[PDB]
Amino acid sequence: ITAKPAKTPTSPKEQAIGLSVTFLSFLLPAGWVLYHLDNYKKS
Amino acid sequence: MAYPMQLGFQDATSPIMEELLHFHDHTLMIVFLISSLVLYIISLMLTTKLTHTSTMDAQEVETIWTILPAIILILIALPSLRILYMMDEINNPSLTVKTMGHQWYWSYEYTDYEDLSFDSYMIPTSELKPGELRLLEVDNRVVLPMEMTIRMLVSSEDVLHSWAVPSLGLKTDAIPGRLNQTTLMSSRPGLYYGQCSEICGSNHSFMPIVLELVPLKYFEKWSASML
Amino acid sequence: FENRVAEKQKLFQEDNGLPVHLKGGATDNILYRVTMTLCLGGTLYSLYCLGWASFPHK
Amino acid sequence: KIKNYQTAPFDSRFPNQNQTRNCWQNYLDFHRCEKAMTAKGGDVSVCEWYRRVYKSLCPISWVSTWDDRRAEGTFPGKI
Amino acid sequence: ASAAKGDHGGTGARTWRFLTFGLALPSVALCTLNSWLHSGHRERPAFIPYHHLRIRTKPFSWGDGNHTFFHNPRVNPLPTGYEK
Amino acid sequence: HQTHAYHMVNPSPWPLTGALSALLMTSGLTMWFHFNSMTLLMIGLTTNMLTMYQWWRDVIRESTFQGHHTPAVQKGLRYGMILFIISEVLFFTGFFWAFYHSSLAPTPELGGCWPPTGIHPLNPLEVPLLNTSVLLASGVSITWAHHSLMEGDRKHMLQALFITITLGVYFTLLQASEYYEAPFTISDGVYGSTFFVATGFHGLHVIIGSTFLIVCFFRQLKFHFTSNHHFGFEAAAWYWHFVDVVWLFLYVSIYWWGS
Amino acid sequence: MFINRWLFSTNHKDIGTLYLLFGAWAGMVGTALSLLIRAELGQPGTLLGDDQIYNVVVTAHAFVMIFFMVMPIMIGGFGNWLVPLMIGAPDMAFPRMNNMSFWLLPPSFLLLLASSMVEAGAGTGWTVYPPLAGNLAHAGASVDLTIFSLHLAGVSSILGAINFITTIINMKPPAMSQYQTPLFVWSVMITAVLLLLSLPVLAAGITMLLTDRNLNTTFFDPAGGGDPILYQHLFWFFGHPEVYILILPGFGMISHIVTYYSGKKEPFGYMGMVWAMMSIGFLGFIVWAHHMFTVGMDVDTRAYFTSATMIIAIPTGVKVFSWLATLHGGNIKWSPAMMWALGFIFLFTVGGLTGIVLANSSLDIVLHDTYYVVAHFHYVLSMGAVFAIMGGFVHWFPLFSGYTLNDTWAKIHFAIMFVGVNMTFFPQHFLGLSGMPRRYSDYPDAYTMWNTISSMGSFISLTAVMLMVFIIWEAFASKREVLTVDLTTTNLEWLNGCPPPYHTFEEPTYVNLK
Amino acid sequence: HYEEGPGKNIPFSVENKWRLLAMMTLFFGSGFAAPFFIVRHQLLKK
Amino acid sequence: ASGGGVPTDEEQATGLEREVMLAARKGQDPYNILAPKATSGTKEDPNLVPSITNKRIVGCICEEDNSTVIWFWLHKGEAQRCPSCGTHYKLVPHQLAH
Ligand SMILES: CCCCCCCCCCCCCCCCCC(=O)OCC(COC(=O)CCCCCCCCCCCCCCCCC)OC(=O)CCCCCCCCCCCCCCCCC
Ligand code: HEA
Ligand code: HEA
Ligand SMILES: CCCCC/C=C\C/C=C/C/C=C/C/C=C\CCCC(=O)O[C@H](COC(=O)CCCCCCCCCCCCCCCCC)COP(=O)(O)OCCN
Ligand SMILES: CCCCC/C=C/C/C=C/CCCCCCCC(=O)O[C@H](COC(=O)CCCCCCCCCCCCCCC)COP(=O)(O)OCC[N+](C)(C)C
Ligand SMILES: CCCCCC/C=C\CCCCCCCCCC(=O)O[C@H](COC(=O)CCCCCCCCCCCCCCC)COP(=O)(O)OC[C@@H](O)CO
Ligand SMILES: CCCCCC/C=C\CCCCCCCCCC(=O)O[C@H](COC(=O)CCCCCCCCCCCCCCC)COP(=O)(O)OC[C@@H](O)CO
Ligand SMILES: CCCCCC/C=C\CCCCCCCCCC(=O)O[C@H](COC(=O)CCCCCCCCCCCCCCC)COP(=O)(O)OC[C@@H](O)CO
Ligand SMILES: CCCCCCCCCCO[C@H]1O[C@H](CO)[C@@H](O[C@H]2O[C@H](CO)[C@@H](O)[C@H](O)[C@@H]2O)[C@H](O)[C@H]1O
Ligand SMILES: CCCCCCCCCCO[C@H]1O[C@H](CO)[C@@H](O[C@H]2O[C@H](CO)[C@@H](O)[C@H](O)[C@@H]2O)[C@H](O)[C@H]1O
Ligand SMILES: CCCCCCCCCCO[C@H]1O[C@H](CO)[C@@H](O[C@H]2O[C@H](CO)[C@@H](O)[C@H](O)[C@@H]2O)[C@H](O)[C@H]1O
Ligand SMILES: CCCCCCCCCCO[C@H]1O[C@H](CO)[C@@H](O[C@H]2O[C@H](CO)[C@@H](O)[C@H](O)[C@@H]2O)[C@H](O)[C@H]1O
Ligand SMILES: C[C@H](CCC(=O)O)[C@H]1CC[C@H]2[C@@H]3[C@H](O)C[C@@H]4C[C@H](O)CC[C@]4(C)[C@H]3C[C@H](O)[C@]12C
Ligand SMILES: C[C@H](CCC(=O)O)[C@H]1CC[C@H]2[C@@H]3[C@H](O)C[C@@H]4C[C@H](O)CC[C@]4(C)[C@H]3C[C@H](O)[C@]12C
Ligand code: CUA
Ligand SMILES: [Cu+2]
Ligand SMILES: [Mg+2]
Ligand code: NA
Ligand SMILES: [O-]
Ligand SMILES: [Zn+2]
């Protein structure tokens, strides 16, 4: 596999974002259900 | 019962279960081998620069690759089938206890002589006496006489359960409308624990078994004290 | 009866670029759009059903 | 024999781990042997052997239930 | 077999017509003669409340939910016995 | 321009309407079983018939009118219809199994015996014999039709096909009368259970069967089929013979050996 | 156009893409359900609540990974993409029918998701055994919705199998015999015959359960003469064949990758690999009672099933030893996708033996319904079937897209996943030896350490799954276009350019008879 | 005829990488969010 | 007698099905249903590959029963040899307008 260069190179900084956003999209909501767990049981 | 960090099997309280340990010991000798020969040969192929990409001939190597594993497999089966027929065998039992599985406890019937019946629930964590094993302890134990051949019939009055005592090498399913026979032989006395080994609903976790083995003469009194 | 297989053949090979399921004129569309209405219609309904049946009642 | 009865022996007719027919057949063999022995003016204490077995192997509720159905006239087995 | 006739390699559509009209439909007439006699409202069974029959573990999704789909009042008791 | 002999199919809506039809039919049955309503189920069922109609319309459009069924496409249709019949076979197998499990080892609960206590089986020499005769006739009739069609006898192929379908209709009416007269129901434990579900699924297969021949009969009316290219009638025949051999296995298994 | 392209498709490639997307989404749900499981077991006591809500989660985890992830990607994704390009066919025998096989799968899932939100969900296990699965313990719509999931999901599969077999048999170059089709092609053909023959009996069994819950039959109810065990047989009659379904195409991909990345022009012992899978297929049908050794069945039967279950090791051996010979004097190119294949070969062979243990009715007495079983089938599925998937996906991602991934990153992905599944599952061998049962929200004090450790592993496997979503983005973000591919002379899929055109083989390949 | 070539043979758009991140965020994230919000609702009834 | 009343392919076949039926009778396979027969495959007697474009993919079964077809693009030009067995192949453009 030979490729061209990227047409829209994703700098480190841009990579650091995508990594930041992607980790949070899984991590954040799971957290909000798992953190309020106690509250759900008192019902 | 099972203790912290345990790697392998519970200690054989019945001889059958002993037989398994040594058989299991056999099967793992070969597993530990095939896994090492495969991990080794893998690394061998990957750790040379010398090459051979032109077409290669099967027949003669594909012979080793079949005739060896077919021998390796008789070697495993030959004892597996001995120990399986050994579990059947024309034994002469002196006591016949029937167990029933419920959502979610076990009832017991000793009905040879008398009409002795009772339930067997779990001690809630809050009510264990200091020293008592969480999720394992029962209010009423299965007192059985030790060093004798016992016939256990298993069924359930609702969903499927499984009647399971690892240390003795026992596990038989409770199937409603079906009386499944296993045989029980303790080489030693003491307390011998087990749990439900089929998913039966909300408290599958929390419906354990505990055998108490004791002499015959400490049994017959316990029988008479329960009617 | 008499063979009209040759008329229906010319109708269906005509280079109007209608896909096969509209090449029969007017009706096919009324049968297409009537069909799709009930599917997407009864799909929406069946969600509301799922939705109702999820909570406890009375 | 019954003087030294501990429990049911191995029945060469029922060698398999499934013993549902063992409990079943020895219950028929009592209730037929009993309809037999009170319909000719004899001793029921011949039918004892099958009473012991069926009780040693049969669960309580299963007998419970077949009794209520011999009484109710809904017992599906011929006696 | 319990069957004997003799190959007729003579024509296709004709033979299978021969067989239709000669053998196949005659069977269905004889078989009908033999049912239009032997089929007639035979005496209905005395009811016994047998627990392995007339199961109701959940109501049916129709009627009063205690009647089967092809329920026949004359020959089909309910759990609690025959309908008048 | 293509230089292979295969069918490239125009974009169709119908896979979607069928898939959706299913979600309606299954959430519909659930809605009938549990909240005791047939709203959704009739919505599902209708979309399904409209999807089935339109789909197979376009198949004919594609074959009779556009002539896309080249000798290749048509040899893939055989391979298809035959692997289908296999899949129907393994399903029916599942029911025979249910039967042979339950009759060969009866439980204490039944009497310990087959037939159960309280079950009054039908005589297999009565209407069931007459049912067996009708179908086997209709394999003599449809085989006539094929030979008539192949020889280019349009007339004798319609007479043969008409006799086939009318027997099919006659099997169905006979069968639905025998359901009604039966002194046992789908509720009569595992006898009734096996009997209705199995003789039942078979019965819908005969209605599917007669439907598919009635299509064949209208399509032959409009001169769709040649001496040599008539796959839609082959598919139907095979299916019809499968529906007959299954009956034979039912008759011998459930009616006679289980009487 | 968009509605015509994606909703209405009759393009074998555009349909493959739909599956890769569906199966990617399924994986997200499968992962969450697997994390929840190990949230609950990662310390003693109770987290959600009782075994009920716990087993709805356990059960759902199983159906999603099996029916909506592994079969949809492996068969419908890679099938629909690669199969026609490997035999120079322009599309599938039945392309309209191909699309219904896709669109039947959202529905199927939604009935599954409905089941878990109606009443208390269907925590029955993936086996759905009566009488737990029956209308007295599981009264409600849940178990009915689950039965309907499977009906639609089995129609997708059976229709899709009819399509492949008819495609692979009928639509090759005339000169081409079956014996000159790639190993993948063979894997999928065999995997479609297993589906074709087993799914009908699965359907039949879950149909008798619907009519026991709803129409007052007694197939599995001892009250009406029925037998709960009857159900176990019909289901397992399907359920062994179901698992050689889940690995066979992995065999396929693995035969491909190890060949391409060893620089060899064909894999070692082509006809050996053909005999192997046709065997594994065949013997996969005559073994189903090895799942039922504690139900109380005649000793003579139990010893057949023991012995029959173990014969499978010989033809599976042939395949392990072939791949290894396909490496022998190879020019090894150390790609991510080679790493995925190599791992497969060793962790499949681990799991493969741990199930030869299980073959012995003797041991399974003690090992039945313990984690030891869970450990066996998470090495063959998590560390085989998913390794094939990531391997393939990594090797063929540029064919579907036309872009390269970042190979460094993609080894960083392999690296973390390796440490995660092995730490997840290697301790589960110990738990089931010590006799920890399956399907428990909570465990005796004794079993804590391994259960802590097992769950730590499941948090490493999460980092992996999140990384792979950001690695798919980067590649599309960056848009590095494939230029040139090696080994095209023996790998026809790569011949039409990355990605290949809507219409491929519009003019068929020339292959002459010598 | 439909669009040919890289970034054309998918039912989403890769024309701008930051809309693409939003798209993959929802797609994958929704699917991973689902089991959690489903376990919540089962505890939130009774 | 029959009466007839059943149309025949000769009469009622249309579209591609017809084009195959008509081509087959003249001894031609324009839609690639039969396998081509091979030549000596030397440079003087190469394997002629009829195409509707300037390239077409050839597959080379270098010897009978061989498990692996060698594939490559074939172009208008000089003959081309299989990179495995060096067998020769030549592109032969024509068309299918009228
Ligand atoms: C990070 C994950 C966690 C790893 C776990 C490590 C454990 C650390 C804890 C302290 C560790 C102390 C002992 C180290 C051995 C651990 C495992 C073992 O061999 O245990 C033996 C048996 C159990 O046998 C027993 O009955 C234990 C008796 C031990 C006696 C030895 C002398 C005393 C020292 C041991 C203390 C216990 C003695 C009391 C007990 C007495 C009897 C029970 O376990 C089994 O059956 C496990 C079944 C797994 C089979 C998989 C096949 C192999 C895959 C890879 C092969 C190639 C290598 C590449 C490898 C690459 C791929 C992995
Ligand atoms: C892809 C999935 C997959 C694969 C490939 C396998 C492969 C095998 N499985 Fe397993 N299995 C499952 C998925 C899988 N399994 C699942 C999901 C369950 C549980 C269902 C449930 O209960 O929830 C299960 C359960 C299961 C049980 C029931 C255990 C119990 O419930 O108590 C048994 C018993 O025999 C078994 C056996 C085998 C055997 C013999 C193989 C063989 O195919 C392995 C053969 C391969 C090798 C052995 C390695 C290669 C061979 C060699 C290198 C040759 C040399 C070898 C020797 C000389 C022995 N499996
Ligand atoms: C394919 C099947 C499959 C897979 C992959 C998994 C993966 C995992 N499973 Fe599961 N499991 C089962 C099938 C599977 N499991 C079955 C059948 C049972 C028995 C069920 C029952 O008892 O009824 C079970 C039971 C089970 C138990 C026991 C439940 C109990 O007895 O209480 C546990 C406990 O930890 C567990 C954990 C895990 C973990 C940590 C993973 C992790 O290893 C997973 C890590 C994440 C991934 C591997 C994600 C991969 C995603 C993709 C590859 C998509 C991307 C693709 C594209 C974009 C194209 N599993
Ligand atoms: C002459 C034959 C007539 C054909 C049948 C006509 C109409 C209704 C049935 C449709 C066909 C489907 C059948 C499959 C389901 C069950 C078997 C039905 C057989 C039948 O008709 O059963 C009747 C009961 O019907 C009942 O309960 C009511 C039955 C209605 C409920 C519908 C069943 C819903 C479940 C379907 C499951 C779908 C599975 C499909 C799988 C897809 C592929 C995998 C029997 O009569 P009875 O009065 O009990 O006893 C006789 C007393 N004199
Ligand atoms: C369970 C574990 C058991 C392991 C099994 C072990 C097998 C034992 C085999 C050992 C021999 C090693 C052979 C492999 C290296 C390649 C050999 C080679 O290169 O041989 C060529 C093969 O090509 C030809 O013909 C074509 C025919 C090819 C024949 C050679 C390949 C056979 C072996 C390949 C399989 C590798 C598997 C290893 C990993 C599992 C033949 O060339 P020549 O006739 O000119 O040689 C003459 C050399 N003399 C004069 C010194 C004899
Ligand atoms: C500890 C945590 C931090 C993260 C660790 C770092 C992770 C991974 C970064 C990997 C860096 C690149 C790997 C080297 C080579 C492969 C990819 C590459 O560097 O990209 C090359 C760009 O070139 C060029 O330098 C042109 C210019 C573009 C350079 C591309 C890379 C720059 C940014 C990399 C660093 C990312 C930082 C991430 C932080 C979250 C293109 O690929 P080639 O090398 O031409 O060959 C690949 C062949 O398929 C093509 O024929
Ligand atoms: C609750 C609802 C239950 C169902 C109720 C009724 C449903 C269906 C009715 C029966 C099915 C009828 C199908 C007719 C399709 C007509 C199209 C056709 O027959 O198409 C033919 C091709 O066959 C082909 O695709 C092959 C076509 C095969 C169709 C397959 C039929 C069986 C599938 C039915 C579904 C079963 C579901 C399972 C039951 C639980 C077209 O080629 P020819 O005919 O050779 O044309 C050539 C000449 O015209 C010119 O030379
Ligand atoms: C209780 C509710 C549960 C849910 C059940 C309902 C599910 C689905 C209902 C939707 C099905 C009806 C729609 C019509 C489908 C017809 C497909 C068909 O008949 O497809 C044909 C090929 O299949 C062939 O013959 C061979 C295959 C024929 C199969 C016919 C369709 C089967 C549908 C039922 C499947 C049941 C499974 C049976 C085994 C358990 C034609 O292939 P196409 O690509 O179409 O076109 C190609 C062109 O060359 C044709 O000119
Ligand atoms: C197993 C899958 C995931 C495992 C790893 C997850 C790690 C969780 C990442 C953070 O997610 C959480 O972060 C906060 C807790 O640290 C929560 O804030 C909660 O707590 C704050 C303070 O404690 C409040 O002010 C906030 O509003 C909120 O309630 C927040 O809502 C929740 O998303
Ligand atoms: C454009 C295409 C999409 C169309 C979708 C819109 C349809 C909306 C219909 C409203 O729903 C009705 O459905 C059933 C009508 O029969 C009733 O069920 C009732 O049916 C039983 C009697 O058949 C009763 O016993 C029950 O109480 C049950 O509520 C129900 O009350 C009523 O709300
Ligand atoms: C179990 C269900 C009951 C119905 C059974 C259906 C049996 C299937 C028969 C299909 O028809 C084939 O076999 C016929 C018998 O061998 C041949 O008939 C005829 O075909 C020849 C020419 O077409 C004639 O010359 C002969 O007389 C011959 O009888 C016929 O050609 C051929 O297509
Ligand atoms: C896989 C394919 C699935 C096939 C689906 C088949 C659908 C079955 C139709 C259900 O029939 C209903 O018809 C009437 C509602 O329209 C009602 O009848 C009523 O009327 C009857 C008269 O025929 C009486 O016996 C009763 O009172 C009864 O309630 C009742 O709700 C129910 O019987
Ligand atoms: C004849 C057949 C196909 C080879 C061919 O025709 O091209 C070959 C290929 C796979 C072979 C089998 C496998 O290679 C595995 C076995 C190898 C042993 O040396 C002989 C028996 C053995 C069971 C083989 C018999 C026979 O030689 C097979 C079945
Ligand atoms: C309509 C057509 C006459 C014109 C033609 O040949 O196309 C004829 C040919 C054969 C006829 C059919 C056949 O004679 C079979 C059936 C015979 C019954 O006596 C009348 C209805 C019956 C179903 C007929 C209907 C109709 O008259 C048909 C269909
Ligand atoms: Cu009782 Cu699990
Ligand atoms: Cu299995
Ligand atoms: Mg079990
Ligand atoms: Na817990
Ligand atoms: O397995
Ligand atoms: Zn060559």
Residue numbers in the entry:
A (entry chain M): 1 to 43
B (entry chain B): 1 to 227
C (entry chain J): 1 to 58
D (entry chain H): 7 to 85
E (entry chain G): 1 to 84
F (entry chain C): 3 to 261
G (entry chain A): 1 to 514
H (entry chain L): 2 to 47
Quote the authors verbatim.
Cytochrome c oxidase (CcO) is an essential enzyme in mitochondrial and bacterial respiration. It catalyzes the four-electron reduction of molecular oxygen to water and harnesses the chemical energy to translocate four protons across biological membranes. Mammalian CcO is a large integral membrane protein comprised of 13 subunits. It contains four redox active centers, CuA, heme a, and a heme a3/CuB binuclear center (BNC).
For the SFX measurements, microcrystals of bCcO were prepared in the resting O state using a previously reported protocol. The structure was solved and refined to a resolution of 2.38 Å. The structural markers for the oxidation states of the four redox centers confirm that the enzyme is in the fully oxidized O state. In the FO-FC electron density map associated with the SFX data, a large 2-lobe electron density is evident in the BNC, indicating the presence of ligands coordinated to heme a3 iron and CuB. As guided by the resonance Raman data, we modeled the heme a3 ligand density with a OH− ion. In addition, we modeled the CuB ligand density with a water molecule, as the coexistence of two negatively charged hydroxide ions in the BNC is expected to be energetically unfavorable. The Fe-OH−, CuB-H2O, and Fe-CuB bond lengths, which were unrestrained during the refinement, are determined to be 1.90, 2.14, and 4.74 Å, respectively. The O–O distance between the two oxygen ligands is 2.53 Å, which is shorter than a typical H-bond, but is consistent with a strong low-barrier H-bond. Intriguingly, our current work reveals that W2 is not present in the O state, signifying that Y244 is in the neutral protonated form, consistent with the conclusion drawn from computational studies carried out by Blomberg. Y244 in all the intermediate states active in proton translocation (PR, F, OH, and EH) is in the deprotonated tyrosinate form, suggesting that the premature protonation of the tyrosinate (Y244) during the OH→O transition, without the input of any electron into the BNC, perturbs the charge balance in the BNC of the O state, thereby disabling the release of pumped protons out of the PLS upon reduction.
